[model samples]
Target: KGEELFTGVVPILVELDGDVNGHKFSVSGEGEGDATYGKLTLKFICTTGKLPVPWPTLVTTLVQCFARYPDHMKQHDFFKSAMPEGYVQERTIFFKDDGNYKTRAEVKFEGDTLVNRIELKGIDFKEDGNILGHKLEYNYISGNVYITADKQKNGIKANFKIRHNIEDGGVQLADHYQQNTPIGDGPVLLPDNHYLSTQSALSKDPNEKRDHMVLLEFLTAAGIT
Candidate 1:
């Protein structure tokens, strides 16, 4: 409950806006019917410097929301009052380096199989620096989760979709960075043969048949990254 401890005292979703990036943005797309999954992915993007604000706003919030039990879990009242109906924060998993406090964040949903929360490995920063690159490791991302319900019943499957917009602000076409470029503000999904093959399991929703087709149309609209 290291981070979950704080979400109980203060709801964290809205508070992390400053750290991930200067702006907290959300990407949403819907399909027609109840039979298919409708998902939402939140993105937090940030740059370096004093930022006029602090970067830990994002990291600290994650530390609060992901903490479990005696470690830092959300308060019991938070569960009883604000939690999804018939669901609990089942578990939390983290990815951290040895002897370091910085880590990635993830949470599981008990009753609802589809909904899950995740945070990326944040950059470790020194309080003040001269030698260890006092810079807040800007190489990071943060976002909300989505677990769509196919039916009100037990037919459930869970998958992960990361917020794609978190990117290096300085990334230019010629400048080679490990991560991909910005893909937000109505991202035009590109035709990726690789992605199609990998995501073959997700079936198109019957109700959103037309909407889904239109989504494909968006892919061909532009060819710039």
Candidate 2:
């Protein structure tokens, strides 16, 4: 005799609080119904030189959770019947650049258009000057991904406000400098347009879908979302 394991697909809802060093914060939200998202607020004071905290804690966690949120939809009968190969594919790919590591990007095909969720990561540093001391310099970029609706060559035309929030942060040196990098913590929008591409892919044939699909898939992987 054993208690059954409830393997049913489900989302989450919670109130969370925690601290780092002396810094403290809390997060609150719901993922159970139509609004599958969370919101957080943080307060902090730092005297330490290096904060191993590369990415913002709560927001990044929420986004990662949202990436998995569609699993419930994926398990729907029609969704499975429609795409037997599976509608979601996620992976972490590193590039030849210095700023990216363990970043993730996901993809799906909607009718004829391609959908993407690409994560951007940055960690570049520099110096200040010969002012008897070099000041703080660390350009750290984080958060935001590109999702297109029409997804045409003219990027501005296809984008549906996915580019609204730019990540922000602080930095290091001066001679060879990279300032105002990225700082996380932005409200994520789930507009309907994000899920659907208004126009068809390069060519409207499903075969052409296959043809350009690989290119788009490769490019989104190679380029930014």
Candidate 3:
């Protein structure tokens, strides 16, 4: 468990149709066919205390917002300062036409820990579910992922760690993320009533609140930007 710490932002390109196995899905950028761009904000919060349950619980919040950032990057110094040893990032997006999507990802560390790869699996996502007529947005549910060694092949141990990433901190590496966590059964999340939020603001201001933006990558069937 951690408290709010340093913040960082990165640029992300959410495009094309990508499926690891049979999890077929699509995503769009802004308005065209397949071209879309956005920003991701990193919020490092502190929570040193362990929760009473085996996993973290849900809590609705408007504290999160949607906006485009001017300082987004595929790879950034923000992560560099934190994971000082250097690491590789990758994400696989599994989406559905119904607006349901789940992203499976792994972050590799060449640093000095027995654990080299952090496999984040079944990080589920869906639209913000607001009545905006023709708009796109998402609410990233609070959940957990397992920590394992390179695909669990190095004889390294695996443990489940609670994900503290409120925004796109987990997706900041949306650009440089290398790739995959095995497809399997895990906890499925269900949120309380007030579970709605978005990634970017309206057309009125493309450059709205730059401070809270988070990067994202989509697997869609669009043509050009």
Poorest 10 consecutive residues of model 1 by lDDT? 213-222
lDDT of 1 by residue, 1-225 (tens): 212222322222221112221223221222211111111122223322232322322222221112122212112212122223212222121211211112222222334222223332223323332112222323333322222222332211122232212133321111101111111122211211111001111223455423121111100111112
Query: Which residue runs of candidate 3 sit more than 4 Å off their true CA positions?
Result: 1-83, 97-135, 138-140, 151-225
Model 3 TM-score (2 dp): 0.23
Error of 3 at 76 (Å): 24
Measured against the true structure, the TM-scores of the candidates, in listed sequence, are 0.20, 0.22, 0.23
Q: Per-residue lDDT for 70-175 in model 3, tens only? A: 1322111122222322223333322222122223222222232111222223233322311111122334332222222342321112222222232333321111
By TM-score: ranked, best first: 3, 2, 1
Candidate 2 at 140: error in angstroms?
A: 17
**Candidate 2: regions farther than 4 A off:** 1-9, 13-51, 54-98, 105-146, 149-225
TM-score of 1: 0.20
lDDT of 2 by residue, 79-120 (tens): 112221112222222212222222233322233222233333
